[PDB]
Ligand code: HEM
């Protein structure tokens with residue numbers, strides 16, 4: 001076996017400067033020279049960057065138990081009181097137990113049928129309500145200012161959906177608490193993105209760092225917001241009426257104190273703070289997905305109509321769209337796939353770490369080695385796509401107008417293996433409904449002669465420059 005190849009790097013800082021502010025681009029160029037498995041250093045810490053579709057499937061799936069770890073990074077110790085299911089270094093049985101708790105909690109209050117309704121699930125009911133409230137809230141703004149920034153109001157609608165799933169409450173568009181955590185200068189993705197020097201340069205943690213201090217401050221608010229919520233739930237907890245994911249986790253803490261010799265490492269805190277990762281991933285990722293979609297629709301009015309054309313054909317305007325129709329709207333799915341692929345707003349997965357001495361593609365990787373997974377490289381690989389820099393939803397469509405299931409499965413944005421996203425289905429359905437309910441009823445546009453920076457801003461979930469020039473109009 002051999003060591004992974006890689007370019008020369010400075011002895012003290014390594015390849016920190018080569019990455020720059022857009023590591024996904026710098027490491028994609030690098031992979032073109034050194035291949036799917038290459039090695040770098042940020043400061044003194046070695047890091048292995050994985051690219052290529054087959055090679056990544058090899059490591060995360062076929063050797064998933066070897067690459068299911070999390071590196072011991074400082075920024076992660078500041079997330080969820082240093083006991084985050086998703087970010088802590090714990091990758092053993094305690095983690096797997098928490099993961100199953102999250103999986104069941106989501107399934108029970110997202111995909112399961114809502115007792116109030118017969119023909120709808122929890123998720124479908126929530127999105128329909130918020131989608132309607134979103135249209136009304138935008139009609140107010142078109143009557144007055146005549147223009148708006150969609151992110152400010154889409155982030156609220158998306159939060160109420162995941163907030164109802166986790167806590168059993170929704171918030172008005174002007175509840176400070178909400179905006180105080182979601183849109184009030186939240187730099188989580190800014191600091192957690194792979195390659196943060198603070199994680200590899202120990203001195204940057206102690207120097208004047210306004211970005212890092214804001215990260216510690218707001219993370220402590222989240223954990224205090226949780227205590228408020230968990231306390232409000234324990235007080236009103238009805239033993240036979242489980243209301244949301246917070247209750248299903250409290251329900252599991254009760255059955256735990258009833259065991260003769262219960263386990264101590266899966267503490268009550270590590271069982272309750274799971275809702276924090278679900279809520280944090282929930283409102284952030286889906287909001288960014290919808291935001292990019294609106295940007296692509298406004299910058300490509302051609303594809304906007306073709307979506308609206310397929311809606312009028314497949315459904316019409318006599319009723320709102322529903323999940324059952326998702327299977328019969330191929331252009332909508334091709335547009336969502338092309339949004340995930342073109343933007344790749346999650347360019348890197350959360351960094352992984354090797355749980356044991358292993359090998360990959362003929363190279364030796366020791367235990368504890370930090371690993372980056374470059375999804376952006378896949379979604380923009382010249383080998384897999386034709387003109388990857390162009391936004392072409394039609395690339396996933398066959399000559400007869402159906403989804404090319406083989407090509408759609410090469411869009412990697414949710415991860416793979418033992419660590420893949422556990423809210424993938426919720427995201428794919430939630431994004432579909434918001435766009436379907438909206439584009440059936442309204443038409444978005446942006447006037448000529450105004451700057452609309454489509455350049456992504458690097459981070460865990462890449463954002464774009466806020467745009468205050470969006471306009472909405474009802475349809476005929
Ligand atoms: C477009 C929407 C979404 C995208 C693109 C996305 C993507 C991802 C990615 C790339 C990862 C890490 C992959 C890896 O480490 O190998 C991840 C992890 C995770 N996601 Fe998502 N996600 C989305 C929506 C959601 C939603 C809606 C939820 C919950 C309601 C969620 C919950 C989680 C959790 C808990 C993890 C951590 C799992 C673990 O570390 O074991 N995600 N997601």
Ligand SMILES: C#Cc1cccc(Nc2ncnc3cc(OCCOC)c(OCCOC)cc23)c1
Pocket residue numbers: 079080084086182186187188189214215218219222276277278279280281282284285346350460
């Ligand atoms: C991929 C992925 C993934 C996967 C799992 C989880 C998470 N997210 C979180 N997970 C846990 N805690 C989060 C806390 C968060 O807010 C704390 C604010 O501190 C500035 C938070 O903010 C998201 C807002 O985007 C700007 C996200 C949290 C993401």
